[PDB]
Amino acid sequence: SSLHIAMFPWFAMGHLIPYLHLSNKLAKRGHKISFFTPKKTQTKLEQFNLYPNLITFYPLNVPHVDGLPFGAETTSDVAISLGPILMTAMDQTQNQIELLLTQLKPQIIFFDFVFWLPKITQRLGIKSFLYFIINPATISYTTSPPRMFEAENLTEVDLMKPPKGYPTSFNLQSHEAKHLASTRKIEFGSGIPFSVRSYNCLSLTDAIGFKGCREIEGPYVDYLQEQFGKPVLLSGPVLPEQSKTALDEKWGSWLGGFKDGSLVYCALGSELKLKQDQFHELLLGLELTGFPFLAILKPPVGFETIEDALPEGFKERVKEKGIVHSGWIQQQLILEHPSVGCFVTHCGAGSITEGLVNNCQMVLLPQLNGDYIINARIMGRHLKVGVEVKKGEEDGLFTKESVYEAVKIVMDDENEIGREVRSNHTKVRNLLLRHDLESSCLDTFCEKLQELVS
Ligand SMILES: C[C@@H]1O[C@@H](OC[C@H]2O[C@@H](Oc3c(-c4ccc(O)c(O)c4)oc4cc(O)cc(O)c4c3=O)[C@H](O)[C@@H](O)[C@@H]2O)[C@H](O)[C@H](O)[C@H]1O
Numbered sequence: 001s002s003l004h005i006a007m008f009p010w011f012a013m014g015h016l017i018p019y020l021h022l023s024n025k026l027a028k029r030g031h032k033i034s035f036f037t038p039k040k041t042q043t044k045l046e047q048f049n050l051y052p053n054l055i056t057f058y059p060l061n062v063p064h065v066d067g068l069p070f071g072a073e074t075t076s077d078v079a080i081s082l083g084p085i086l087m088t089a090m091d092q093t094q095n096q097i098e099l100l101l102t103q104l105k106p107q108i109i110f111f112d113f114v115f116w117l118p119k120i121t122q123r124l125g126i127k128s129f130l131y132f133i134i135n136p137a138t139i140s141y142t143t144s145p146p147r148m149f150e151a152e153n154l155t156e157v158d159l160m161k162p163p164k165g166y167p168t169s170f171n172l173q174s175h176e177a178k179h180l181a182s183t184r185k186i187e188f189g190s191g192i193p194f195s196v197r198s199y200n201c202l203s204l205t206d207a208i209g210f211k212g213c214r215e216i217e218g219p220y221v222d223y224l225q226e227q228f229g230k231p232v233l234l235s236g237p238v239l240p241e242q243s244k245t246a247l248d249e250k251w252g253s254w255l256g257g258f259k260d261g262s263l264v265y266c267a268l269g270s271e272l273k274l275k276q277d278q279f280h281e282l283l284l285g286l287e288l289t290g291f292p293f294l295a296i297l298k299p300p301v302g303f304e305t306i307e308d309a310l311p312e313g314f315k316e317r318v319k320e321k322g323i324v325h326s327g328w329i330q331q332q333l334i335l336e337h338p339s340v341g342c343f344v345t346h347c348g349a350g351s352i353t354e355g356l357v358n359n360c361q362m363v364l365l366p367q368l369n370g371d372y373i374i375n376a377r378i379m380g381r382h383l384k385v386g387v388e389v390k391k392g393e394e395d396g397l398f399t400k401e402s403v404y405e406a407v408k409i410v411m412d413d414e415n416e417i418g419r420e421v422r423s424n425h426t427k428v429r430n431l432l433l434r435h436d437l438e439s440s441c442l443d444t445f446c447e448k449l450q451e452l453v454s
């Protein structure tokens with residue numbers, strides 16, 4: 001029998017988009033989806049609803065919290081330092097969430113972050129499903145019970161080693177472990193420290209789920225299932241679905257002028273601003289390769305326009321071979337275009353998948369975020385599908401020569417490391433796109449959800 005599932009993702013494009021890709025996959029199999037979204041954001045989401053008779057949006061009013069910009073709904077509307085306030089706002093939707101569950105009565109609700117939800121759902125006879133679209137390797141490394149019990153004894157040297165029983169080995173740099181140690185105790189909404197929230201979600205939910213497949217994410221999902229004693233499901237890799245909006249002709253025309261495989265595409269998401277020094281090193285590094293490039297970047301900290309912040313003489317040198325641009329673009333459609341030979345990525349979970357299923361060579365430039373960093377290590381050192389840009393051990397900064405080097409290595413047909421990551425990327429692409437991989441992931445997924453509501 002078909003299920004009725006409610007979706008309550010975090011207020012961010014990086015969560016709304018994959019939750020919507022998955023809803024389309026579930027509705028194709030006959031399940032009804034009640035999709036809770038911020039009110040104004042719904043306009044941007046309609047293009048992705050491929051089953052409007054089965055997927056219904058229910059808007060939420062993102063309540064004012066002191067310090068939150070007027071009308072702000074998602075992390076694309078506020079600086080990264082204001083994320084905790086937006087979380088306080090999402091906590092404050094509790095009243096409209098209880099009303100929606102009462103009227104719609106789903107059997108399951110997929111959610112992020114809101115650890116007060118399982119109490120509500122069990123009182124209504126609803127099952128709570130904490131559904132992550134980030135890497136289970138990340139949750140495993142930072143939020144398994146062994147880390148939580150040290151409480152305030154957890155320090156930078158502690159986070160250079162995996163927790164007890166962690167299934168794989170990789171090395172973090174000193175500045176990365178320092179990031180993890182300080183950010184985990186920062187309050188993220190309603191006075192709750194970041195890792196304590198999440199741990200509460202993992203502890204109190206009925207079941208846990210992750211984007212991913214057994215062949216990549218399995219070892220981490222197994223570890224989490226033994227640690228928390230409840231089912232940890234895999235949805236399959238959530239392959240991007242086709243939008244009902246074709247590629248903007250301005251970009252199609254401009255991309256179409258380059259020879260196949262020659263363009264470097266660089267994008268670091270929609271949540272972060274580089275510092276001006278690193279903004280310059282990145283762009284000068286791209287220029288040094290001599291390849292055409294398209295860089296999708298916010299203006300650096302302190303600056304409001306790209307043109308203000310460009311290195312001196314930059315526009316006059318690169319001419320028509322390079323564009324630096326600030327707006328939201330159709331990244332999935334760009335990564336599909338045959339001009340793109342190389343993808344310089346911040347290693348966000350969605351961008352990782354979008355790169356893996358395409359032909360571009362991957363250059364990994366993770367920004368300061370636990371999932372980004374761990375994605376980059378796995379991609380660079382375990383799957384070996386891309387080349388990571390060298391950063392200073394203690395300061396976390398790169399040179400333009402390190403950017404130039406990484407792109408040159410993967411674009412050089414005769415370079416053996418470039419050839420090796422190409423071959424490894426093809427192997428991973430062939431697995432993710434295998435005719436029965438996602439379908440049999442979802443087969444198991446839906447069976448296990450059926451068990452959950454039984
Ligand atoms: C400022 C950032 O704040 C925190 O991340 C905030 C970000 O979490 C990301 O999603 C994340 C979640 C997460 C995801 C969904 C959930 O339901 C949930 O309970 C947790 O958990 C993490 C746990 C970690 O130990 C480290 C992380 O980097 C993340 C993370 O990035 C979101 O995609 C972003 O939109 C959000 O801005 C972390 O401390 C991070 O390291 C730090 O750089």
Ligand SMILES: O=c1ccn([C@@H]2O[C@H](COP(=O)(O)O)[C@@H](O)[C@H]2O)c(=O)[nH]1
Pocket residue numbers: 013014017267269270296327328329330331332347348349350351352354
């Ligand atoms: O200009 C942009 C910036 C980001 N994205 C999309 O936003 C998501 C960012 O997720 P993540 O890579 O941060 O996880 C991805 O689906 C990415 O394709 C766009 O479509 N356009």
